[PDB]
Each structure stands twice: as structure tokens, then as C-alpha cells.
Ligand binder design. Sequence first.
Ligand SMILES: [Mg+2]
Ligand SMILES: [Mg+2]
Ligand SMILES: [Mg+2]
Ligand SMILES: [Mg+2]
Ligand code: NA
Ligand code: NA
Ligand code: NA
Ligand code: NA
Ligand code: NA
Ligand code: NA
Ligand code: NA
Ligand code: NA
Lengths: 1011, 1011
Amino acid sequence: RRDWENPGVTQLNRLAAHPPFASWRNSEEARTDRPSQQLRSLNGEWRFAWFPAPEAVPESWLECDLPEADTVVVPSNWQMHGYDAPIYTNVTYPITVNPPFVPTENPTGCYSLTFNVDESWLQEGQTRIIFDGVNSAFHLWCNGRWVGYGQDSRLPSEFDLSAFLRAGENRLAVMVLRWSDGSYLEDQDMWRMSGIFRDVSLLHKPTTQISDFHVATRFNDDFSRAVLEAEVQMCGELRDYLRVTVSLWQGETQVASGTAPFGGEIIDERGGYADRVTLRLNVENPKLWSAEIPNLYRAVVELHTADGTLIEAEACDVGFREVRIENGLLLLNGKPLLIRGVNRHEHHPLHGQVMDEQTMVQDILLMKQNNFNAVRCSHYPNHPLWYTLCDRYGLYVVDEANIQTHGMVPMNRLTDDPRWLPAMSERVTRMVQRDRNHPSVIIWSLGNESGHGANHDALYRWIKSVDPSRPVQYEGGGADTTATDIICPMYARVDEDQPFPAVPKWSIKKWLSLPGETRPLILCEYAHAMGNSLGGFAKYWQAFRQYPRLQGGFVWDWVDQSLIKYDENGNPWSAYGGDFGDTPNDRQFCMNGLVFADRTPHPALTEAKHQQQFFQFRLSGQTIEVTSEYLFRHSDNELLHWMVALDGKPLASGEVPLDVAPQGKQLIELPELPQPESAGQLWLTVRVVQPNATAWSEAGHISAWQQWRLAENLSVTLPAASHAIPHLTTSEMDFCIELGNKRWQFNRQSGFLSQMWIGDKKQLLTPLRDQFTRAPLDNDIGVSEATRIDPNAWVERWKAAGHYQAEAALLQCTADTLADAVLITTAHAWQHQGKTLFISRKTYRIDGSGQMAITVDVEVASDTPHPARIGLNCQLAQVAERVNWLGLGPQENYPDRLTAACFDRWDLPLSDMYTPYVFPSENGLRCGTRELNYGPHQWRGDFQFNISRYSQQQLMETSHRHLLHAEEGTWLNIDGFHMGIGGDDSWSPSVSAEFQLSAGRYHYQLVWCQK
Amino acid sequence: RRDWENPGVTQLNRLAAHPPFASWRNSEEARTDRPSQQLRSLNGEWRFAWFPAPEAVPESWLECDLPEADTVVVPSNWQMHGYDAPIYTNVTYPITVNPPFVPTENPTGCYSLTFNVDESWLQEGQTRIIFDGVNSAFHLWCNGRWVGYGQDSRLPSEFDLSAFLRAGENRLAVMVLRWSDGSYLEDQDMWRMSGIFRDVSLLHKPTTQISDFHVATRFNDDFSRAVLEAEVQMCGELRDYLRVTVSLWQGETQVASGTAPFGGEIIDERGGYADRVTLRLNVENPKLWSAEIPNLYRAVVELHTADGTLIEAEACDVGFREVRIENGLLLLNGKPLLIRGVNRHEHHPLHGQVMDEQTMVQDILLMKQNNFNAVRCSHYPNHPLWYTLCDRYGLYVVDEANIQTHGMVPMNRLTDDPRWLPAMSERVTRMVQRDRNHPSVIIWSLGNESGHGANHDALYRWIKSVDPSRPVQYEGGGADTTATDIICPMYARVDEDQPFPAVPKWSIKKWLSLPGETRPLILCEYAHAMGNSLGGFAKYWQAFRQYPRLQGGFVWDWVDQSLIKYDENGNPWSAYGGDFGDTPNDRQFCMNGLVFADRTPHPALTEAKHQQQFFQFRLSGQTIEVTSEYLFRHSDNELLHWMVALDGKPLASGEVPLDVAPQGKQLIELPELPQPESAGQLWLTVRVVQPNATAWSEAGHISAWQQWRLAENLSVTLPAASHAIPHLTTSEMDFCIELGNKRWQFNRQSGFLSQMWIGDKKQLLTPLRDQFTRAPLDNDIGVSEATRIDPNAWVERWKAAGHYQAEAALLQCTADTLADAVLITTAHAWQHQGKTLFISRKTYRIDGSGQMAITVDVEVASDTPHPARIGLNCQLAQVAERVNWLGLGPQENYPDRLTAACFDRWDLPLSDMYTPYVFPSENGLRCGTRELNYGPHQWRGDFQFNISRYSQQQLMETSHRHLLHAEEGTWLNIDGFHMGIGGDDSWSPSVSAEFQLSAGRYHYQLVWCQK
Ligand SMILES: [Mg+2]
Ligand SMILES: [Mg+2]
Ligand SMILES: [Mg+2]
Ligand SMILES: [Mg+2]
Ligand code: NA
Ligand code: NA
Ligand code: NA
Ligand code: NA
Ligand code: NA
Ligand code: NA
Ligand code: NA
Ligand code: NA
């Protein structure tokens, strides 16, 4: 029959979808969410054999274990055990595009298990097997007898095994296909993996059973009264003595209870549902659920007889919350949401797409600790535990149907085809049937990047009909179609229009006010966090705060999709697409996360945390205004610490308790600050600290911060006249300057400081030279490759103009003796094929104090692409343990991503001054720096710098971070000016005009001396 | 696999649905709609073997013909050849209700055909088979090899046979199943038949082919400009030299043309459809399509090369029209429709559910001739030729999906179940894909009586998305749900509310103005035409005309669903449900047609014609005002004939051409009419006559009529005093009156006129007695049965009150002699077990002129159910050929169904005074009669009458019309008063209060004399 090549067959003998069941036979166990004896896990050691096609599977495998088979752990993806390569591709399909057919060579995973069943399970009731996730399709046998078939990798497939099992030993056989017609709806850009990758379980239900239940909560106008409505469905024989009781619990306190026999209200001419009942419980002053305060109740559904004998019980966590769009605003409990969201794929660097509790909790804690309140299930229903954890920890969830057809041409080719409506309907309907009782799910999504087809309109309406409690969104076909309640674009910019034909990405501010438009706007994807990125992140949040109908968005994305590989020595290294031998591939485009695969933060995470802060600050005189952005909670775990420092030297500090109502304001008057005697700039830093630990954070957690410049006292005092006078020694090749045992050598051929000496010790391994380039970031490169060059990309514009190739031509090199100093004057021109790109004019002034004052004035040809940087570089002989600077830090920061960084005195190990981006680039920059200290050296001015053991050349020429080698000495890059990093997306230039180096003429000055 | 018990499997290897194809290889043949050699009919003689189950089918049938098999005509229903019994059932399922399972005893029809295929068909291109209608499911084999599977009895199933066929002799094997999971969606109230009941064909297409095309017509504000947009899709290899030309023709004149290569506009980020193109043709002053003037163009779609070589051509008829709902009104071409509709099942008394052109054309002609402009496809897509004929003759069509689940408890059990959404979607989507190019289709329907479920809402939105040119309607779940653009109730009454729980049927006038309601109301079913019915029909049309938003409805229904059976002598008779040995059955509830199965009209059809007239009339003095109800056409085939008569005697007549604009008025001034010499009532009759023949009518066709009373001259002149004096003779048992040769005998024990003589000739066979009962109409009975009594039904109320058993008790019987007359005075009481139901007081006055004046005064007990009639009856000895009367006629007419009848002198054969309803009842009544003549007898007064060879007793006791026997003499029923017939529905009392005999006291008077 080849059911895996037929979209008319998505399942065979599969049971109906339903909310999580456990079939408790004790009500109290249901109430407390204790493990149920009737729900058994079949996870663990299974038998597995790989085959090139389903035709290669020997008939004997159905009857008994194959000797060639291995013992593997389930759940698992079989690629993670090295049976075949995990394929990765971005836009194009991993297979030949000819629907509904798949390749004849279809990797087949043969799973089997020998397991025990209690006789009590078979003497009464129903025994079913539950596969929470099988990728992408499977056939099931039990004791040699065929049971059924299933598709959709991301939802549970359940089969009745009551007629198949025997008491004692039984054997399952599961034939898993890598490719099916299901694969055409599963084109998410990620590692293409297969197998039994989610839990396998056995569930025993009584013959007379709860088959479905739906929980709704309606509210009065001010949410002081609620009605919990619970619809319960049954299967089996209806009897007059049957009853349903629904009880509601707040912790250990029962708040309400209701009992009724079966028999629903009349709904049409033929009567009503005899096999259903709806219970209604009044709740006075309900404790409302939100991400801020995840108040939960417990609902217990008891199926029983009139005399009080329990048949079975089911239960769920209930969150009293209302989600509605009104007057163009998404409201939760009557209040407008501001979505601090992120997209999160299910990814583990070691276990692939297998999810576990520890990884999930780790993600949620890190998200909430970094001021995220929302998550998008990109792009499929998640492991069932995810929702439980989001209910309890408090996160807003967008639950998304497992439908992506991004490789189709055009994108809507399947989704506009009525012949694919059945298969698509199943992916939407079975998701809703499973997850509808979770309070954390506030929005349904119809899938991702599948264009806009009629099937979307149909399924949009289906959800609106069955579940009016949640808005429906969908981005395909231009982000504002008739299939979405929310304008939900991907990578629409703040101020800049991108007017693509048919599917424009308008400025988000402009999009809101288009003729006739009234809906809220929440970006389903924004701020592409690929490599050194999140440039311009602050621009989004300023817009979100200013515009009521701009209600936030979901960052792309949470975690790098890298996998661990082992070299010749067996050492682990982070691998991306193309490293597993898969071709065609899309290189490092799978790594766009705010955290590394091991959940170590990227520098961008702190920028996200700062901008997503829940308290806003203003300073007027001595008064600090604190405004709460919380909608529900008072600031009952918040203390404001303030500190005033003169150039990093602390002068005054204090702490004030925060007492701010939701949306409220608190004024804090600072005490009289003493005027410092010394020159310099006073800086005020405030931080919000959480004194008490929570479910999601430790005691002392910092949740918010802000800085201001206070009084500045400019230095007017002249330094004391120096006793020593520097001497100029002139040879043919060199201008030399001597001061005691110190020496500065300027090569007259090159026109650069070629060496410095302190006694017999040399300071430089490479001369001090101008630098106008950086090792290209992911955003500089875009989609440009060696075989497919994108001439628009920043790196290619730099390469074509000769920026990386330009040679310094000496125009001038003179030396003059002043009264108290030696003045070296130089001029250079960087040319490429007759074209002067840059001109650098310098003076070097060395006086008796041992200070070298360097003045730099650069010309940049108006018609050359704006340079990545304007600065100097050298390789220092010194290798020191610590780096000490007065400037923005402590973390890496760039001009369009420095809001999170604070001005202060910072001291870090040299290793912290390098960011280990998997794909090496310009990294570790610190801006707004007024003083830098490294070993004996001190640099003073107003500059940007990075400092590491890796040259810009090595970073540029090395593909992976694990292939990098520490060079001799220390490479220093000191920039007068540095270009923004961008990141609005990673496939087109995204650096905003104000962060491009376009002024034409630039000036900076430095002082180099010994500390 | 048992695919016929799986709602997830509705087809295997079935090709996509599409508009009618013929694959012409000649453009002129496509333009002219001539037969195509590439479309071959496989209709004719096939081989057939019946089996009790699919398991009972021998494996040799796949390869070789069975000797036990018979030769049958295809298309056919196998129940019509007597293989098994055609089951009839209304609300209940004919099978055990256990979805998706069907009975193990599942009658299986094995069809096979051996046929020739020419090598040329297989050498190149694609050969497909098309089964237009197979009931209910089937597997297909070709030359022993399995091809595919299909469900949905009412749409074509198509399969590619290109790889299966061989040059020369080929054999098809079709295993048809009576029951499948498809049956759960096919629970229409009709005969349950099966087999290959629509056409079978072979279609040859090239490999590079037109695979789909859609035609839209859009207009400017005043319909003076139009754009025809034609989307053309292809299959096969795309080449740059490929072209599509769409040409539009008005007869033999090409009005527009457009040519383009393949490649549609960009629709998303992935581009557009390379295999599609859209052509736009401008049309100035288009001739518009309507039911009034069915103007058609021909669109020809040519697939060709750039150098001019035709590959293939497809085509369709195009009607330029716009259907939209605006401000609560359904509009066609800017004008509000008034739907004069009827429901039409596909039924033939000899061929069952097999349809032919002759029958279809016969139905359409009769419909249009009786002023119908609309048809509802109750309850499934029709034979493809139906739409062609409606396009060409001009009828508005509601195309309805083959979805009915009336037997489900509750009615929406399947339609609210997402697991049934795939199967339901196919029934909707494949209908739209087939029929979307037909201009006659103006409204889509989601099916019938399937409650309201979320699946309806999903499919409603699907249609709205893919085809915004047509409104969507659906009655289920209360007629006004979110799945309907039109309030479309079944059997909602005009003034009377029926407030059923959950699904009330409001008064249609009330329904429109319910809080928040804005939609149009068109009844999907109304005026149930079961037996002697359509009482109160005029009430609907008065309402339709008065209320803008009441836009008509569809009568239930067109044709009686009786079948032909034969007796011992081979004489045919009409059989209903239960006559074919099927049980449980719903008796004569299959016969609700306006015409008999052979298309002979019921009397009700003339009432429909008159009420649905397109011209309205008013009279003011001498002025006749004629108002056109046409929306588009001038009255360019209409002449007004007027006649003035005095008690049936013509005094003046004339004719005036009608020249009335649509919606316009014409005033016609009648000439000076001379005052008559005689006493009596002048009557004016007008009729609209069509002088010219049309496509749908003959010359002289009468389309409209109306009558008014003019001047009346009351008779004041005393008749010449009669010389003869009647004489009274008294015995103990009789009062006898003598006048020359004439004798009247009144029995003194009974109190009735027992005999009359003229010479030796006796006039009566049964005495003249009061009658208060009628042989019960289908409406009087409702759903009441002998085993299941409905005590609310009129017949049961009458029975329980003793009306049929009432025995006359004599209270008074006297004889008086007047100067010139004999006076007989009588009084009777009708009592049932001590209770007096009626009292009748009479006088009989016989004077010297031979005239017997009868005065009747009746008392009806206020607490007895209102009587069916208040009259007299007798069995006359005479059998005469003709019946002549001055009153309403010529056809049968009742108090609530007499608007179509005209007051004139009528003369018919006796047999025309009996209406042969298949289920015998009171019939043949004529109302408002002032004079009746039969043989030697004349009756004068103001009465209702019927006259036949059948007593009320025989009509009541005889089940079928073919079992009736002419009794001796002639049964005369003369009523002072007669109850209404009702018919708003036929399962509850429907006789309106104004037509019930509730006055308590009644008076009428008759004169009986010799003519
Ligand atoms: Mg399949
Ligand atoms: Mg700041
Ligand atoms: Mg089926
Ligand atoms: Mg009239
Ligand atoms: Na906002
Ligand atoms: Na990605
Ligand atoms: Na606090
Ligand atoms: Na690199
Ligand atoms: Na109307
Ligand atoms: Na019927
Ligand atoms: Na005329
Ligand atoms: Na009868």
C-alpha cells in the first residue's frame, strides 16, 4: 500500500487525540499530580537495526529479534548514534521535490522491545500504547500482528493494544521511515533527524472511561468573579448510576465541587449528547494566572457511580486567565501585554531533538532570569512537559501546528491545495485537542512559512469555532492575511520599509497605520541573533514602549543548533551544517541563538535582558523616577541600589526599597552628594536587586539597571614641567627617540612605529599600523558564498573595493625637535588599482614624562564603501593575565549594541576579552573606553578596543573556533571608530545609517605610556 | 484493509477534481460544443453478479468473467433490476448506527466490461476512466491489476489507466459496495439504492494538458463594463514555447481574446506559479445572464505552441452575472431576487436514481411553465448535464454538498468531530472544483440536516476564500448559524412561531427582525406538498412580496418518489415505502411532489403557478394596473386578455398588448361595459398570454391570471306564481310529497329524505344525511400510525371524539302544509357514548315548481375538535358522463388553496372530478359553487362539493389508489363549510385558525330541483 507516499493516509487505527491522561484510580493521587500506576513508561533499552529502505527489512524481524540489531536507549534520534548523517538545509528541501513521493532509498529504523504486561491490565479495561514523537512515520506490530500506522512527528500517536497483548512477555516492532509524505509538511530549517525521539508509554483505562475533558474560565467585568466550565466526555456503556464530579483546589483547599449524571443540554432536533456532561463551578475572587504571578488551581475530574465508587480520575492545572483582542490590543486579564519573547526549537547538542526535564528547566530559568516572559514553539507542538513547566513557572506560550512547507514553489503550493487540507487539518486539530487546557498557551499558530492558502483560512475558522478563548496567528503570505488575528511579521524593521512584491515587510510603526488596519503587531521572529549580532535591538524596544499596538515580539532564537563532533584525538568540538558530510548544506545558518548549545550565554543575551527590563528609569536633578511595567504584581521582591563614582572610584552608595504598584511610579530623592576635589566625570548607576530567592532566581538576582552622567569637572591643571628631555637620533632607515633606558623606533621606509624598548626588552612583535577592516561578522557576510557571491553584502563590498588588499604608500615622514618633546609627523595613502581609499595623517609627540601622544586624522573616499573600522593595531610582545579598563563593560559591546554595558572600572582575565563564536570573527570589542591597562602599558583617550591572542587575519581565515591557535604575544586593536554590527536579519545589510562610518573625515587621539 | 469502514480513507489513487473536460483537438469543435472523440462513453451492456458480502466474491472474477453473471444496462441501480429490495427510511438509519462500521452483510455489486482500446490512445498521452456516480463505494481493477478506490456517491471518481491498459481487448472489474463509511454522510430521506448509476467514460488527454481552469466575471457599478478573468493550470513539461489563448464568443462572433505564456504573478517569497497563467478579457456592454434572459457566451481555452500548433482545447458556457448580498438583500446584477424555487431529488419511477436528458428537460420545462425560477439540488451534486440545462434554459441553482447525517444523535455528532473533517471537506471541495464555472449556480450549500458542527464553519470559510462570487448557505443547527449567509429554515411558518428548544422555527416575518439579525431569509424547504396539500401557500407569497428581506423559498418538493410495480395481469401501479417488503419503513412519506412520478401535475401545481406569477394586478373602477415583477426583461412576449361575464355568460372581451418595463407599471382602461339585462354577478377575468413560442413554452402559454367581482344585480323579480300544489301523504313510517309525476319520501324513523322518484325512476341508493367527517388527508394524519398513535393529529382527535362513529338520534320530524308548499321540519343529535357532538336542524320546503329548498342549521359542541366538514351526502342512482357547475375551477380547490381557481361556468367529464392521489383521501372538492348540474339534477346555493364513484368510507379504508373500485351510482358531497387542508408541514397540525370550523353555529341552504 505504501502509506508513506500517500497524503490521503496520515494514520491507520490511531485513537482520538485528547489532553494528557494518567487514569488515576485514586482521587487524591490525581489531586496531587502523583505518578499513576496505570501510566507506565516504556523508555529505556530497546533493540535497533538500520536499513537503507523498507524493502530491505527481513520478514523475521516481526516474529523475533534480529541478531544484527544493537541495544540502544529510547527516546533517541538514530543519527545521534551514528547510523546515518543528520542532514541540514535552509530553504530548499532535503529531498527531491516531487509530492507526494519520497526517495526510493528511504533510511528505515527498526525498533523492537520485549516487555512485561500484568494480567490485571488485560482482564479488565483498555491497554493502549502512546508514542509521543516518531519522526517521520511508522508502522506498528505487537506480537507479530500489525496494529497501525502514524504520521506527524510532533504529536502523540496512540493505539489500542488490548486485543494484541498477552500476560507476561510481549514484543513490539516499530518500523520508522525517515521520509514520508508527512515530510512535505515538516520542512523546518534545522537538523533533519529521525526515530523514536519522544517518550513511549502504556496507559490502562477502564472500559467505561473519561475520553475527553475541556476546561474553560469566564470572568465578570473586573475579574472578581469567575465560572469554571468543564465539559466531560465518556466512552463505554452509559448507565443511570454513572456520575461525574469536578472539584477545584487552591493548593490543599477545595474551593468548589459539582456533581452530575451524564446527559448534555439539547443542541438540535435530535436532542443532545447522552455521553457528555458540563459542570459549572462558581469561583469568587479567583487568583489570576499570568507570567508575572503563575497562580494555579487543580481541577480533578472523577468518573464514579452514585454510591461513591470511583471508576477513574483525570486532572489538570488550571490558570484563571482571559486572553482577548480588544480595540486593537492583545489583553491578558484586561491589561495590554508586552511580549518579551523568544523562539525556541527543541535542541540538545548531544541528544539532538530529544528533550529532557533538566534541559527544559534550565532554559526556562535562563529565559526568566533574562527578562523573557514568552516563548514561541517554533515550529511544532512541543514535548508535553514543556507546557506543564510554562504553566508553573509562568511563560506565555504560542503553540504552533507542525506545518512548514518552505521549500515549495510557490510557498503556498500545498496549503492552497484542497487535497492537502485533510493532512493539514490533522496537524492543527490534534494539537488543539491535546493542549487546549494549558493556561500558558495564550495563542494558537497555524504553522510557519507555508505561504497563505485556502486551507489556512479553513483551519483558522475551525479554531475560532472550537476555542474562542485564544487568538489565532499566522505569518505566511505577508503576515497580515485573513488567517491571522495579529500582524506577526518576521524581521520587519523599526523605521525601514522593505517593499518586496506581494509580501512587503513594512516598518512596524508604518504597518500599524496602513489604511483600514486595526490589529495588534507582535513579530513572530525578529533580531536575528547569528554570531556577533543583536545590533539595533534597543531600537525595537523603544518602539514597543512608545506604540500601544506594537506589543513586542519573539527573538530568533534561543539556542545555537550545533552538535558535538570528535576529532582525531577524540576531543569535542561544535559542528554545524556541512560538517557531517551532508551536501547541499547551509553552513553556520543553524546557529542563531542567544545561548550556546551548552546554554552558555552569548554577549547579546545581556543586551536582551537590559532592554526587556520591567522597570523604567528617569533622572531629574537628585530625583530618580522608577516606573513599573508590570501589569499585575506589586514590586514585593525589589530593592534599588544606587552608586555614584568618579571615573570608576566609588564615592557614595545606598539602598532604597522599591514599592511600586503595577504601572505605578516611585520617586527616590538622592541624598546630598559630596563634590569631589579631583577632576573627572561622576556617574550614577542604579540596579534593581531581588533580595529573596524565587522558583526561577537566586537571592541577590539583578533584574534591571541604568546609568547617567552627573557632574563633570574638566581638568585645567597643567602637569609639572618634566626634568628629562627626550633626544632624537636620526639614521637613514630610522627616527629614534631616547629617554633613559626607553626607546621609540620609527622606520623611515614604512613610516610606522616599528619597535619600542624598555632596557633590552622589546615591546612590539608587529609595527603599529592603521586598520580599516575587521574579520567579517556573520551579518557582514550574509548569504554570500564562494560559489554564489552576493555583491550587496558588506564583506563583498569591502573585498571588491580592495579594503583587505590596500597597501600603505608613504607620503611623508618627518622628525622635529621641540623644547620639551620630539615630534614625528607621518602621512600614508591606502590605494588599490590606482584608487586612493584612505589617507591617514599622524603626529607622534614624545616628551620627558615617557608619554607618546598620537594624533590621527583620516580621510575616507566618499565613493568607497564605508569601512568596518578606523583605528590602529599592533602585536604586543607582552602576554599578561589581566585586562583593566575604564569604559563600557564588563561584557563585549559594539556601537549598536552597548546599552547593556556600563561605564566603570573593569578588570578581567585576558580570556574574558575574547568571545568564542563558533564561526570566528571580529569579537570582544569594548566601547567608550577612556583608559586601557595591559601589563606595563597604559592607553588613554576615547576609543574602542579589543585585545586577544588572535589576529584579525587568523579570525578571518579560520572556519571553526576549535582550529584557532593562540599567536605569539597579544594582538591589540584600538579604534577611534567602529561600524555597527547589525542583525535585523542575517541575509541583507542591516547596519543602520547612523552606525555606518560615512563622515568622510575622522579624528581621534591617543596617549601611550608606561603605567 | 477494509477501506469501506474507514473515514480516513475516502479514495485511493483518485485523480484531482476539475470542471467538465472533453479534450478537443479542434478549436471549432470546442467553440460549438460538438462531441469529442477523446471522450468515449462506456455506457451500455455490462456484466453483473450480485453478492451478499465482499468476502463472498470469488478471486476468479478479477481475471475472468463469471458464467453466473447477467448482462445489464449501465448506468443503473441494481435494485431496479430486482436483485435486492430498495430500502426506504426517513429519520432512522437503514443500518445499525455504529460509526464508522457497516453491516457484515453488505450487498456487493460486481460489474465488469470487456472493451477495445486502440493503440493510438496508449502510444501517447493519458487515458483516464471517469465514473460519474457509484453508490456508495467501489474498488477498481483493470486487466486483473488493482487500480484504486473511491467514495462519495454523487461526484465523479477518476483514475489514470495509462499503465494498466493494453492494445486490443481490455477488462474492467468494479466491486461496488452498498454500505461504506461514506454512507454515514449519505443519510438522505429517499430510496437507498446502489450501483453504477451515472455515466462511465474514457478521456484521453495529452501529457502536456490543461488540468484546471476557473472563469470569473467582474463588473463596474452599472454593469456596462466587465472583465472576464480566466485562470488556466497545466500539467506536464513546461516549455517556453507554450501558450494559452482564451477566446470569448457571442454566438459566431468573437468578442475578446487574450494570449499569454505560462507564469503567474509573484504571490509570496518563493515567487509564483510557473504552471499557471491568468488571462483578462475586457467586455463592453456584456449581455447579462439571468433566469429571465439566460444570455450565454462561450469561453474557449486553447493550449498551444507559439508557432500556432494546437495541443488541446477545453471550453465552457459563460453567463455574465454578479451574485452578492448587500444591506441584507440577495442581489443578482444589482437587483433583489425573489426565489420561486423547488427542491428536486433525482428520481425516475422506472430507472430509480438514474437520470436522462429527456426527463431533465421535461422537469425544467414544467418548472418554468409553472413560474419557477430556481432549483435546490436536494441533497447532493447532480448529474453534470443538469447544470448545462439550467445554464441554457435559465434557472437559479443551489448546488449542495453530498453531506446528510440526519440519523445521528445528536444530529451534529459527526459534523462537530474533527476526525470526520477530511471526509466532509472532500464532499464540499470536489463539488466546488467541478461546478464553479456554471453561471446557473448562484449559491453553495454545505449539505442538509447534519446539525451544526465546527466542520461546517471550517468549510464555510473555505468556500468564501476560494469562491467569493457565490453566497454560502446551510440550514443545520437552527437555520441562522455562523455557517450561513442566508437565514434558510425548513418549514418555518409565516405568522406562527414554533419555539423548539435550541433550534426554534420562528415566524419568518419575526425571524428577520430578531435583535442583531440583518441577513436575507430564503426558506430551503417550505409548503410540504404531501397528498392533498399546499393549503396556505398564498400566505407565504403575500409575505414574500410585502417584506424586502423575505426573498422566497424552495417548495418541498418537485416529484413523488413512487416506483412502478406490477400485479397478476401485468398492470402497473405506483408503490411507496413498505410495498417492497422493507421494514422498518416510513410509508407514503416519499411522495411530497407537485407532480406524480410520471410528471403528471397534482392540483397543487396550479396554486403554485398562480402565486408565483410575475405580473401583479389591481383594479380601480375601469382601470387595470399591471405591475411587472421582472428584474431585467421588458414584457416583449405578453398580451393581456380580459373577459367580463355574468354568472358564466360572456358579455364582453378584448385584448391589449403589454408593454411593461421591469418593475414598471401599465394602466389599462377598460371600455364602457353595457349594463346586463339579467340579475346576477358580473365577473372580470384577466390573463397574460404569451403569443410567441419560447425555448420553454408553446405559443398561447398563459403565464398569469386574476379575477374581480364587478357590479352585482340582486334578483328582486318575483317568479310567475306556480299553479301546481304539492300534496302531503302520511303513513306511520313515511312523509310522502307528491307533485304530478314527482315524489319525495321522508323516513319518519330516521328523519332523512330516503328516496325521490320521477315516475318509476328511483333517484337515491343511500338517503341524504348530514356528514361531519372527511376521508383523512395526509396532513390530517401526520406521522400517526396504528402502532404509534399521535394524539395531536387531526385524524386522531376526530377518532377519539367519535366523529367517524357518530350516530344520528332523531329529535323532531314534522310535516306541515302551506298554501302552495309542503314543509318538513327535522332535528338530529349526533352523539358518541352520551356526548352530543353536533345538532342539525333542517327544513325542507317543496313548492309547485318542483324545487326543494333545504335549510340547514348546525350546532357544534365547543369542546369537540373542529369538524372536517359541515355538509350533506347521498349516493345518487344516476351515473352521468359530465359534471357542470358555476363556481371555482376547473381544478380541485379547497378553502386554503383556491386562489388559482376562477369563478366561471365549468364542464368536465366525471373522472376529472376525482383526483387520483396515490394514498386515497378526501379529494376533488370545488368551492364557491352557486350551481351544480349532474344528469337530471340541479343544486343551487353557495356551497363546496365533490362528486365521484367513491364513497368517503372507501377512500378512507383503501390504502392505494389502484385498489379502488367504482361503486354503484354516484357519491355526492355537498358542504356548507369545509375545513382547510394545511401543509406548512405534514407531521404536525398545520391548518391555520381562519380555516378551522370553530364558529360553533353554522347555516347553509340549498335548492334541489330537476333540470
Ligand atoms: Mg501517508
Ligand atoms: Mg543606557
Ligand atoms: Mg473509507
Ligand atoms: Mg384571487
Ligand atoms: Na507597546
Ligand atoms: Na536558522
Ligand atoms: Na520591595
Ligand atoms: Na572566519
Ligand atoms: Na420580498
Ligand atoms: Na419525504
Ligand atoms: Na408584449
Ligand atoms: Na386511505
